[PDB]
Every structure is written in C-alpha cells, then in structure tokens.
C-alpha cells in the first residue's frame, strides 16, 4: 500500500529472508560463538548477527527501519573491524552482502519517511 507506515516490516522481513538464503550471509547468520572465539569481545563492543535482527523484527522490537538498518550496518562494520585484511574471503562476503543490503534498504527508508509524514500530517 502507498503511504503505509507498516510496509517496512514486511519489506525488511523479505530482505532478511533473501539475505539468509544468500551464500554470502553464511558467516553472519548466527551470533559469533564467544566461547569458541574468546577474543571476539576483546575487539567488538556490540556483536550483531542476522538471526538477532530477524528475531528483533519479528518481536516488533524495532521502532523504525532506520533502527534495523543500524543493526545490519553493525554486522558489516563488526566484520570489517574483526577480519585481519581485505584479502579475507569473509570480509569479501561482507562487502557483497553489504552492497546488496544498501541497494534495497534505500527505498524502504524513503517509503517509510513519506509514510510517516502522511501519518503525522494528513487530515483524513
Ligand atoms: Ca580489519
């Protein structure tokens, strides 16, 4: 629907589904095992992963798609910070998936911004 403040929830649910099914998401699907990799929290302040993102959205615990976007971007910035070189195949995966996410999220954010101005201002 045009001017739908709820539309982002379905749009982001679909986008996450397409990310989970993409081979490039494999390293990012689940929280890093902090017991297997006990230096991970030495480097990364705030772990994030696509399963946490998907559960947060399904729970209704994101206020806006900007919040979900900030979490997804944290996945990719965490991977950049943790991986040791741009030669890492894991970093390479994070670049391909990042570029895919950013291509699709822009219209979700734009559509949400317009919907919210309508929600706040309309005299229907
Ligand atoms: Ca790095």
UniProtKB/Swiss-Prot annotation:
Bromo domain mapped to chain residues: 3-108
Subcellular location: Nucleus
UniProt modified residues of type Phosphoserine: 2, 92
Tissues of expression: Expressed in myeloma and epidermoid carcinoma cell lines.
Taxonomic superkingdom: Eukaryota
Associated clinical condition: Chung-Jansen syndrome: An autosomal dominant disorder characterized by developmental delay, intellectual disability, autistic features, anxiety, hypotonia, obesity, and dysmorphic features.
Subunit (UniProt): Interacts with IRS1 and IRS2. Interacts (via bromo domain) with acetylated lysine residues on histone H1.4, histone H3 and H4 (in vitro).
Protein's name according to its UniProt entry: PH-interacting protein
Lineage per the UniProt record: Eukaryota, Metazoa, Chordata, Craniata, Vertebrata
């Amino acid at each position: 629907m045009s001017y739908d403040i709820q539309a982002w929830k379905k749009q982001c649910e679909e986008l996450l589904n397409l990310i989970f099914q993409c081979e490039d998401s494999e390293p990012f699907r689940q929280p890093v095992d902090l017991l297997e990799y006990p230096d991970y929290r030495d480097i990364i302040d705030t772990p994030m992963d696509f399963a946490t993102v998907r559960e947060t959205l399904e729970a209704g615990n994101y206020e806006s798609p900007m919040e979900l976007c900030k979490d997804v971007r944290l996945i990719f910035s965490n991977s950049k910070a943790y991986t040791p070189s741009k030669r890492s195949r894991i970093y390479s995966m994070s670049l391909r998936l990042s570029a895919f996410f950013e291509e699709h999220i822009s219209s979700v954010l734009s559509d949400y911004k317009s919907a919210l101005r309508f929600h706040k201002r309309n005299t229907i």
